[PDB]
Design a protein around this nucleic acid. Structure first.
Ligand SMILES: [Mg+2]
Ligand SMILES: [Mg+2]
Ligand SMILES: [Mg+2]
Ligand SMILES: [Mg+2]
Ligand SMILES: [Mg+2]
Ligand SMILES: [Mg+2]
Ligand SMILES: [Mg+2]
Ligand SMILES: [Mg+2]
Ligand SMILES: [Mg+2]
Ligand SMILES: [Mg+2]
Ligand SMILES: [Mg+2]
Ligand SMILES: [Mg+2]
Ligand SMILES: [Mg+2]
Ligand SMILES: [Mg+2]
Ligand SMILES: [Mg+2]
Ligand SMILES: [Mg+2]
Ligand SMILES: [Mg+2]
Ligand SMILES: [Mg+2]
Ligand SMILES: [Mg+2]
Ligand SMILES: [Mg+2]
Lengths: 60, 104, 129, 88, 89, 70, 226
RNA sequence: CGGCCCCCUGGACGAAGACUGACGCUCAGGUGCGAAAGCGUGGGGAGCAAACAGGAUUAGAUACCCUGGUAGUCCACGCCGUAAACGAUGUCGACUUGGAGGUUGUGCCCUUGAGGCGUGGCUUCCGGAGCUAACGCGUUAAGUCGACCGCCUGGGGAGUAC
């Protein structure tokens, strides 16, 4: 798709790049490019701040 | 003028006041000649984790072109109003006048 | 900064000889052209060619004989940090007269032997062996 | 830093030919404006050492340029330092 | 006297050297191994394992121009990756 | 690391799955690392050493194994 | 006798190695790079090859002892065949360190081999407890395999035709130390500095190897015939 | 220098051009920045922890191990001005075979999809010539050269005394 910037509101893609426990997946495993990887990490963090994603696989 | 992007989560018990709040914020921005490029009430939503022990916060998204002084005032309003649980105003270069992925 | 263009040229020649490059190019100057001419006359290089109008580039065509460089050694003598001038009787003999010494005299840049014959000294630019 | 319009205005004011962005006087003016702008910031943020480093660099460059002007053409130097109000 | 022309005609006679397959004549037959020529930098001593029938006796003798997969050229000494690329699709 | 034992799933199988999940998470390793305070210098050193070790070993393996071993 | 370009192209001499493995001393003998595989300049190859052939022919004419050094298992058969075709000496299996530089020792080995072979074959005594026959046979095989080609060389060779300079680097070095002209086939990965008569070409490919042997063999035969 | 967000701000890099026209490089004295520990005044103090206490170990154990634990570590503003402050490699400029990578630009090409061919910048490893006492460095030089500065002249006494 050649997205200009990964979107923190775009949850499904993020959900594909976080593991079951909520941790950010390494770039070795996901195969993401470094520029995108950084962008993705930032987006995930923002979502977590907005309770769109969870910080951890804990109770809720 | 800096393109901003506001998202604020409101306490679900204050959900009946939410249309009015949106109107108020819009009115103030316009008053200060601020454009409003998209405005999406996402509605009631299940939190990924409980904030202040309460679930299902009412999310509003608002991409705006305004001056920073007015943005500051808006932020202050958010912080002091005991209805909006969280807020986040984050600068953007280009006004993303496009529908959000969850609405899309 | 570049502080010695002649020195740079000499260095270029040496490195070209080392790396077996056929020709070596550098920004041309009048002094440089004179030096190149002297070298060609003495036969340490095959040819030189100045090329361009606004900022011309001197291109020397280097000389090989049996796999090894003709210019065995080529040392700067006078340099910006320490100028060297000699009198006609003090003019140096490089490699006991086999190699040449480029000396800038009152009558232009010439080899050491020529200068000695003329009877005048000058700035000793470089030795070539 | 300095806004685009301001830079353009400065160039127009001191520039022999409005596209003369490189002229020495213009360069000095641009540096001067930047330095003046940054004073307020440094008054506020005394510990912004990196930024002050940048400011120092600007000042040094301006000084060097000014010296060059003095040596090359004195009348221009005198006029310029009168226009800008720089000590000596 | 001229090299571009002959080299480029030899080229035009290549189906696809880079990526998929070229035909080639057998150089020899071995035990679980068959040597098939390539015309490339070397010859393909491909494994005859992929050519294993059900009855144990091999169906490749000296001569066939089998559909060897002629990719991955110049692995140091020669070239060999597979020989059942087109023979499976 | 949430796990739920499926209907008519043996216990041993469930345990195996749980262990696997834990391993993927890498929880024990993290706790072990956080048992005592590693100095920043030490952490840097360990990382650098690991990088060197990996590169050298890989180079030896890829290269080094093109010879008659016996 | 020279070799044609059409034949060379058919053989596959022009192909070289990957661009990461080339030697920049072989950087002149390269035309281009098609699909990350070097292409050798046949324009520079053919005249050089011809010169080498002429020199080889001349040496044969003056009765020079050529040594065909080739150890690649692909080229071992071919080199051996060529040598025997033109009755010359070869090394198809591992080049023993100091075959030429330590010739008086490899000479001792050669003498031992000759004695063993003669007793084994012409002696035809057979009785040796059985152990001796098995052990002796193994020893004989090893010696014959290693030094069978140079057994009749008597002294040192007067020229060394060598398959692949990078693979047979030791041989080239030995030749250089003693001073013997070298006629090496040199792929793009190989180093040409030790070689006296560099022949750019594909050491790996069998057709190319065969072609090299055949041309050299023909020229040596012609020289000997004179 | 490491969560995220905002406000102020410095540098680097690419692209095309346009402009000034040697305005440059280095720099003794001088000036500024300068980890951690340490000092001053006022805050803060969860965790860790010099000193200190007790428990172990031991011939002893003013240590290592254990339980505690105050300065400190944290914040504001001053001072100090040193480290194996290391690449034990001064700054600036030019030239000299290569390979595999990483990061960030950028031109064209059918982007047959993450591609193909260039062209930069910074960066890790391997290695050639050359250099080196050797170890090794090797286009980011410890290679070939030019400019300026700092420094060395046997070990100790001593970076000590005045
Ligand atoms: Mg910035
Ligand atoms: Mg100009
Ligand atoms: Mg000083
Ligand atoms: Mg401190
Ligand atoms: Mg304090
Ligand atoms: Mg007090
Ligand atoms: Mg206090
Ligand atoms: Mg303790
Ligand atoms: Mg404690
Ligand atoms: Mg001290
Ligand atoms: Mg010191
Ligand atoms: Mg340090
Ligand atoms: Mg030292
Ligand atoms: Mg030091
Ligand atoms: Mg300086
Ligand atoms: Mg940097
Ligand atoms: Mg190295
Ligand atoms: Mg001393
Ligand atoms: Mg003494
Ligand atoms: Mg003292």
């Amino acid at each position: 798709e050649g997205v200009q910037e990964i979107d923190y509101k775009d949850i499904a893609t993020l959900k594909n790049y976080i593991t079951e426990s909520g941790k950010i997946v390494p770039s070795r495993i996901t195969g993401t490019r470094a520029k995108y990887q950084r962008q993705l990490a930032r987006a995930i963090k923002r979502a977590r701040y907005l309770s769109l994603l969870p910080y951890t696989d804990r109770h809720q | 003028m800096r393109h901003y992007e506001i998202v604020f989560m409101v306490h679900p018990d204050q959900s009946e006041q939410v249309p009015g709040m949106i109107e108020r914020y819009t009115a103030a921005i316009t008053g200060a000649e601020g454009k409003i490029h998209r405005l999406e009430d996402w509605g009631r939503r299940q939190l990924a984790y409980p904030i202040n022990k309460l679930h299902k916060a009412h999310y509003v998204l608002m991409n705006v072109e305004a001056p920073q002084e007015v943005i500051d005032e808006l932020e202050t309003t958010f912080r002091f109003n005991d209805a909006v649980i969280r807020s986040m105003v984050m600068r953007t270069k280009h006004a993303v006048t496009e529908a959000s992925p969850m609405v899309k | 900064s570049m502080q010695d263009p002649i020195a740079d040229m000499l260095t270029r020649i040496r490195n070209g000889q080392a790396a077996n490059k056929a020709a070596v190019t550098m920004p041309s100057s009048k002094l440089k052209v004179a030096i190149a001419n002297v070298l060609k006359e003495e036969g340490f290089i095959e040819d030189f060619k100045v090329e361009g109008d606004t900022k011309p580039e001197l291109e020397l065509t280097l000389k090989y004989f049996q796999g090894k460089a003709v210019v065995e050694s080529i040392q700067r003598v006078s340099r910006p940090g320490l100028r060297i001038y000699k009198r006609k009787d003090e003019l140096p003999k490089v490699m006991a007269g086999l190699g040449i010494a480029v000396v800038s005299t009152s009558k232009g840049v010439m080899t050491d032997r020529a200068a000695r014959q003329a009877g005048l000294g000058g700035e000793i630019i470089c030795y070539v062996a | 830093s300095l806004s685009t319009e301001a830079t353009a205005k400065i160039v127009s004011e001191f520039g022999r030919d409005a596209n003369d962005t490189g002229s020495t006087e213009v360069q000095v003016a641009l540096l001067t404006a930047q330095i003046n702008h940054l004073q307020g910031h440094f008054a506020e943020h005394k510990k912004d050492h990196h930024s002050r480093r940048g400011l120092l660099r600007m000042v040094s460059q301006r000084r060097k340029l000014l010296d060059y002007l003095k040596r090359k053409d004195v009348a221009r130097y005198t006029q310029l330092i009168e226009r800008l109000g720089l000590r000596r | 006297e001229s090299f571009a022309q002959l080299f480029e005609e030899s080229l035009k006679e290549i189906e696809t050297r880079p990526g998929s397959i070229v035909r080639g004549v057998v150089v020899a037959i071995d035990k679980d191994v068959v040597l098939v020529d390539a015309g490339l930098k070397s010859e393909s001593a491909i494994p005859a394992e992929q050519f294993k029938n059900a009855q144990g006796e091999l169906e490749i003798q000296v001569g066939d121009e089998v559909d060897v997969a002629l990719d991955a050229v110049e692995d140091g000494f020669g070239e060999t990756l597979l020989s059942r690329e087109k023979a499976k699709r | 690391p949430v796990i739920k034992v499926r209907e008519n799933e043996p216990f041993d199988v469930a345990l195996r799955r749980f262990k696997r999940s834990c391993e993927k998470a890498g929880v024990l390793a993290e706790v072990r690392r956080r048992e005592f305070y590693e100095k920043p210098t030490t952490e840097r050193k360990r990382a650098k050493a690991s990088a060197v070790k990996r590169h050298a070993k890989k180079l030896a393996r890829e290269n080094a194994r093109r010879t008659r071993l016996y | 006798a020279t070799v044609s370009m059409r034949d060379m192209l058919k053989a596959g001499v022009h192909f070289g190695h990957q661009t990461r493995y080339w030697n920049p001393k072989m950087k002149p003998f390269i035309f281009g790079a098609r699909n990350k595989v070097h292409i050798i300049n046949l324009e520079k190859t053919v005249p050089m090859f011809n010169e080498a052939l002429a020199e080889l022919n001349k040496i044969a004419s003056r009765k020079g002892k050529i040594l065909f050094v080739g150890t690649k298992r692909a080229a071992s058969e071919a080199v051996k065949d060529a040598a025997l075709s033109c009755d010359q000496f070869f090394v198809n299996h591992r080049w023993l360190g100091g075959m030429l530089t330590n010739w008086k020792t490899v000479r001792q080995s050669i003498k031992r081999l000759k004695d063993l072979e003669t007793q084994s074959q012409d002696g035809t005594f057979d009785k040796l407890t059985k152990k001796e026959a098995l052990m002796r046979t193994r020893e004989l095989e090893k010696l014959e395999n290693s030094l069978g080609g140079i057994k009749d060389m008597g002294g040192l060779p007067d020229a060394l035709f060598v398959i692949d300079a990078d693979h047979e680097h030791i041989a080239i070095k030995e030749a250089n130390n003693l001073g013997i002209p070298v006629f090496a086939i040199v792929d793009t990965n190989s180093d040409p500095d030790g070689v006296d008569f560099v022949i750019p070409g594909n050491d790996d490919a069998i057709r190319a190897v065969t072609l090299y042997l055949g041309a050299v063999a023909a020229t040596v035969r012609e020289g000997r015939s004179q």
